[model samples]
Target: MGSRSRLLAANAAAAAFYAQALQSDEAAPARQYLTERSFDAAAARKFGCGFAPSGWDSLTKHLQRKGFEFEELEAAGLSRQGRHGPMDRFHRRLLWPIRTSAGEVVGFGARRLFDDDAMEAKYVNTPETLLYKKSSVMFGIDLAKRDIAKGHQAVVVEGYTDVMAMHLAGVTTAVASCGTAFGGEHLAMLRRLMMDDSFFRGELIYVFDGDEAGRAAALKAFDGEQKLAGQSFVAVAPDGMDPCDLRLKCGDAALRDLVARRTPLFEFAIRAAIAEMGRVAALRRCVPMVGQIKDPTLRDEYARQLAGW
Candidate 1:
């Protein structure tokens, strides 16, 4: 294998080691974590979910014995420098293989399995590697890309389990921003994946919490609306729950309706700004917002709503 190939090899090995470990007796704790989270064996297998054993050098020893050199492991983010030498980066955690659109494993997203985890970070991912980019990768893109393209629709969620739950709920067009906030690189990725010459065109649906934090998130997403050609929508559950929590609390049908009931992000952003800023500030802020509305009737409607307020 060449340099990049070798780096990818380390990730592949790490993924396999983690997956195989999930089946071992030592991974019982991790298995229970998945069960409590509503994922079963089949779901785990489909997501390439894995459990990293607690031993410090477990993955280190496993990779070295498989002919991967120490440098290869470090470059791939699977190993870390320790006083004694190379040590496993992930220990006693549940892992999801992070891959490219081609389905090549590039890195992993890890969640702490035990409350007593020495690591402070509740959720972590493979640090920048030759194969992974925090801003560019989408968690479920490797699996959801084709379906998203086929339907000309994308439901962007906030995390891995949300993508899992959305897919399981039969909304196969969902993908998630991995380690960073959704930004330019992610939108560019979508512009390419969902690009259509004609037909149904394309749409971007973003899910956010129903709280004020989600309102700000929607506004941020609106600023980048010009990057893509088609309309963008927002899906927020009335209870402020994410797709994962919704799937756990509600049935699949509820998740389906949650997506289909989405309203355009532009309208949502405009109304939210006006509602928060109130009379004078809302009028000044949404003046430009109203001008952007290509639909004359809706502009009049929003203006009437503004006047009534």
Candidate 2:
């Protein structure tokens, strides 16, 4: 079908390699991708033995020892090469990994476990790679895509880890934006994934952290609602906490609550804009944002939205 073609637009070999990049434990979504499973970061250490790198193995072991098993993950999915050296993308932070339909490793998102002034980023994800393209991918789409298509609701989350956590808790119908902001492509991707044209009229329930950046993303998502057509809603992690942390503290039930109380994206946007910038409905008054368009038609569409703004 045309939809299948668009979803798998990338090279076949590349997709296969991506699918075989990581391994997930025996689980629903990840298990669905058994053939594509490659290396699990945690298993790479304990089972990989000396083959595993030093620091990386230790991190994996730490996660495994604490019940954090690496399932369908890339080696550096969440690790970065800093001035010090290669370090976990999340340091002393809660971990969450992202995967594809075949349960292959794609990318990750990490959350800072606690507040620290020295911490540069509260949330971090793997850089774009051959397998992981942010704009074209939604975190839980592969898992929850069918449900979204059936029910017309795609729960959007802020962090990669949060997305993983939700999936693990059996709520696979959630997704997250790539690295940057949500854009026309991202929304259109939802439309295609949810089959909006066929009576789906898919809804978007964007879950954000209660922090400033999360607030910012919530406001931006509101702008997306204009082009999205179906209903758009917003939910937040409580008290400056993030979904990753909340999942750890209160378990998946807390994450579900945020979704339960989701407000309309337009209202969420107005609230976030007012709270973050002290201005209501000020999204349009700001400078034109980049990455709003990834193609000619999209560029025209974004321009039209901006013109109205």
Candidate 3:
């Protein structure tokens, strides 16, 4: 088979095996974890959630018996060459299928099931292949695209459960960057999905943590703000909590309220940029950003603040 067909077949085979794994008695713990997080059976099924059995070759054996060659599995990123030859890349993990906008399964993002797993990458995504490109993939765009178009807005969060929580809580415009930070390609994808244009505008709100890392991510996103046609904004969760935990600890309304309180990305950037640095360093950082501001009055105000340095 050619590259596209090979990828398609491999993804299908892995998805089927994942679904069967979810049905096994060994999968109860994984299912229960989802339940505790308010991801019900229906929600799990809706998201095409599944599991990779504990044994390394459970998936490899299943696929091999289905008439697939080791080379095909390797090409699809489902298996890695081992001393004994092809071993499953993901095992003892809960799986979330990653798909394209058209709903074709292109890859998966797997969460580790136990603390003792040899590989400690909390989430392991399918490496770059013919079908999966991490930089361009937004986790829930397949489901969120229509809502994004209608609402003229999008909510970006950090993880799989964050996307699931926001969507289940009626924030249907939610999506997450898969195993990567939000970047230009992701912004372009969202822009097209929102049909963003100079005439018909929109908004893009990012929900990040309230800590240093979150601030860092917001700064990174701000660097790419010009690429987006929509108004860019940032919402920082209280106490550095993510949407999923915030929902479970507080409630859905709290999560919704958090998004509702977004501040313009520039304002957030300015305040955050200055909030912790020396006057000189802070002024240096804000100068470039202030130059991008179009309004004279606001620009003057920021200029005065910078001049104070």
Alpha carbon lDDT of each predicted model: 0.83, 0.52, 0.83
lDDT of 2 by residue, 32-144 (tens): 32212332344322211111112434443443344332331223343345566444443433333455655454555444434452567766666666566767665666667
Candidate 2: deviation at residue 82, Å? 16
Q: Worst 10-residue stretch by lDDT in candidate 1?
A: 221-230
lDDT of 1 by residue, 1-309 (tens): 438988988888888889998999878887887788698999999989999888899998988998888888888899999999899988888899998989999999998878788899989889988898898988999888899888888999988889999999999988998878887888878767877774336889988866887778876743544534227888889766888888888878888999999977776777677676536666777677656666676558666665655
Model 1, residue 94: C-alpha shift (Å):
0.9
TM-scores of the candidates are 0.91, 0.53, 0.90
In candidate 2, which residue ranges exceed 4 Å CA deviation? 1-52, 55-131, 222-226, 274-309
Which 10 residues in a row give candidate 2 its minimum summed lDDT?
45-54
Off by over 4 Å in 1: 198-200, 276-278, 288-309
